[PDB]
Design a binder for this molecule. Structure first.
Ligand SMILES: [Ca+2]
Ligand SMILES: [Ca+2]
Ligand SMILES: [Ca+2]
Ligand SMILES: [Ca+2]
Ligand SMILES: [Ca+2]
Ligand SMILES: [Ca+2]
Lengths: 225, 196, 196, 197, 225, 197
């Protein structure tokens, strides 16, 4: 693109990811702030729709964050962002879909449509979204009108302060009744993948999450459940 | 970036007897009334802004019987059993099954001057558990409470308790109706058929 | 360069029963009342400015039964069938067939302070289909709707739905009356006998 | 006061891409824009469009030959375009390659829009519609009315979106993209859900 | 392209077309000026050469222009431009060819060669020409050295003023003898498509025409033939 | 207006001093803080902590070997500290000789506090609690709920006070001191006494 309205589709997009060292700061008053990025999930697309879901809580979001936040009893999301990066060619067939849900009791979407309604929805070709790189690496952002990434509206969730929960104990409590969950986690991410070309899954891309968290009220790592 | 509406609708039809009859309504969207149920369901959460349960008679000057309403918030708390019990709960209200004729203005918001008579009460949104509650279905709620009641205080805000007595007969009598005049902020949209 | 008047007149006499009785009135000049019918007909068009249907009892303290009114605008919409249905429609209103005694002041516009009790509602001229509707006759209207209902939303603004129940008997009972207090702008004159 | 204002963005129609110019049309009214709104808008008798915007969003390979077209008609009586040519005349004519438009995305999530010149999307000229307020009509009852005479519809629906999907590479369908609608609406004069037609 | 001489071919080109409202102006003296753009024709390419021809007169050029100019007895072309937009991938095989002829009696070209000689000739890959978008949308023009579009040299035709003719009556008159046509239409566009890959036609692109016309001497729409 | 604000100071728990580290815990809620408040708070459905402060006050000889520890946990699901070490991590960890703290006294009678550095006392960080308002829960009903699953408690109680009483000189108990609580509370949504659970 030189003029206006003209667009050139590459044979394939490429984004070189480099995650910078974590950012931690113990701000007097109690809170310890952490802002970091981590590869949150691996993606694959098929000709039939597939709905994947991931809880947006510490233990689940980040693999590093898991071990970190463990030393604090509570936490408050300050900014959670799931960005998508395509690791395939434009010759690949397929689209992605993401959005959030807030009451785990609600059934998980089953149509690209139902999902179009969720909060912070996003769709786009499996081979696009490279634009969002500047988010993950943390550089100066250019044109993001083409990027595939959504953010959690921390502005309005159940509480500001949630308890650090462990996948294990969590599930155990959800086993009793799902509902016990709402006071354990803010919301969850919904991810759909359809419009693919083969019955056997194909390498689509990957989703990195870049968050900023507040951690409070310390505890021995192993005393936390 | 939300969506806010205000409306009024019959929340439940009332009948009086010779003995006390204690009933209760959750103050959540699904259980307030038909309309707000079928709508608010298209949003994952919601926050009460102004809940008002108003009673409005349907009987003759000559139809002995009174009515009582109040609130409760810790669902685990035992449901009242005497008119006295109910007098204690917050935002109480008593009156003859045929009174409250004036509580009408509350539903067609106009020049509401004379509202002393009015048999209606208001939910103190000002301070309930959380501020944003998730939309729940009659079904899924009872299901969860079936385990333990307390899983409810994080699911609903409070519930309106009601009692009718000092009736003319021992068999139900055409009393009146309770309408709810609510204003709500609903958010985080979702396919209607997906909400539980 | 128009012509504007304001008046009030009996729009329909009411009766209550043991079962629900749903009736409806178009909110067009011809169907509001005798007077405004025989006048507004001398003008091709008209625009509502303030429509108010007010109920006024005629029975004794002891005459069980309630009354309900609300509006609808897409004539094609199905006419309500339960008190609940009617509670949903806009500008609802409920009350005992003997109440509304105070809705009187609305017809002899004076010092209307106490109007809570008042069983009356208002048409939101503020926003209906068109702003200038043509004067139509009961006859010619039904004739056109006989083809398809929808030819009506361009002919009338909205219609008032009414229901009466919780009655004392199973055979009509002297209830009250509904009067209409309207203010209208009528234009583009025409021989009375020519309007359809 | 009195009204109620929803502003949302949901899938309005999935698109199949072929070689034989198939031409469709959707009414620009609540019951038709999308499933979600259809569900809500029902609780209100009339409504008025404030800002209606259909936006095409791809979901296919770059190796997918094809172009898509959109436009508006307002006298429901007019004959739906027979040729894409005829279509290129309508108000808000727009057309691009069935795999481009990736940029239009900023209309669906309501983010900060950078350059939207490459976005396959058109809007509704609300200021020039017959009535300000329309009646919520169900596809059913509408058809029944247009059955007697189409003109009885000009007062039930503001406009119609004409969509053409020509140029492809195969004789059968190939999933291409979706057309989401991002509308701002004023819903009024509430009513029981099942009583609306 | 950063340096000079280096060129990058996209997997596929994309041009988002948006036609702006017509431009009409009744300039005292008689003439009514109209400048508008319309999708003039649909394109397809095959392995064997195909020669298409379109008269460059009101009734034929534009589908809207047809109904408009009907209300005037004569017209004078002021600027006629046929632009091409590719709606396919660079992986597609094929080239286009356009030019003008002025004496309908002349036989229609049959070789990409003969056509190379015509006035305002143009050739180019079926999947290119996206550059010309700025013409149709009517934006600021960038590098057009790559665009596939030609213009009618209004400077030198039979008359300046031609009569509005209808396809019907026209053909009827040409049925008598083709020659009667020269005083009925200025010239015509020739379009060839060969160098394709399949025997069965493939979706190539589409040709939009952007013209500026002068219309004069009014008449009841239906009295015009 | 509407609320009701009590601010009081009563014995929250008597302390026995031994040599084998015995570790206890008390919920930081009305029914558990103390007998008096338990009695009042019942007349109100919900409540919100404004300022909670547990203070240890001796009542033994200076020849009484022993140390006491206090701290807070908030995810009721977490395992109550097994070692005093684990405890020294919690928010508001504090610990001193079971005969000192004489100075903390100025927290109970509400007098003018001179130097309180030697006082064995910690406070509750109210600004960082899950909910602002909690439901008054009876130990009974609470246990019954945590019986099904502990997590069902995180929304019933703000935090838990972990107390450790290690280091002593005898194998049996020796009266050491008391932990009084000095709280300021907002009681709301009144209710019949016996109807609260
Ligand atoms: Ca924990
Ligand atoms: Ca829900
Ligand atoms: Ca007339
Ligand atoms: Ca309707
Ligand atoms: Ca002619
Ligand atoms: Ca309680």
């Amino acid at each position: 693109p030189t003029q206006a309205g003209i667009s050139m589709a590459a044979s394939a997009q490429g984004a070189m990811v480099r995650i910078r060292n974590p950012a931690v700061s113990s701000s007097r008053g109690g809170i310890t702030v952490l802002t970091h990025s981590e590869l949150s999930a691996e993606i694959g697309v098929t000709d039939s729709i597939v709905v994947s879901s991931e809880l947006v809580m510490p233990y689940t979001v980040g693999t590093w964050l898991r071990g970190v936040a463990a030393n604090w009893s509570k936490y408050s999301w300050l900014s959670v962002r799931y960005t998508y990066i395509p690791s395939c060619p434009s010759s690949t067939a397929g689209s992605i879909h993401m959005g959030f849900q807030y009451d785990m009791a609600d059934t998980v979407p089953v149509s690209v449509n139902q999902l179009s309604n969720l909060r912070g929805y996003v769709s786009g070709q499996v081979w696009s979204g490279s634009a969002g790189l500047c988010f993950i690496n943390g550089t100066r952002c250019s044109d993001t009108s083409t990027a595939i990434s959504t953010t959690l509206d921390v502005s309005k969730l159940g509480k500001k302060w949630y308890p650090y929960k462990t996948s294990a104990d969590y599930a155990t409590a959800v086993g009793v009744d799902v509902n016990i969950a709402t006071p354990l986690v803010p919301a969850r991410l919904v991810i759909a993948l359809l419009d693919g070309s083969s019955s056997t899954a194909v390498a689509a891309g990957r989703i990195y999450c870049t968050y900023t968290i507040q951690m409070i009220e310390p505890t021995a790592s192993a005393l936390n459940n």
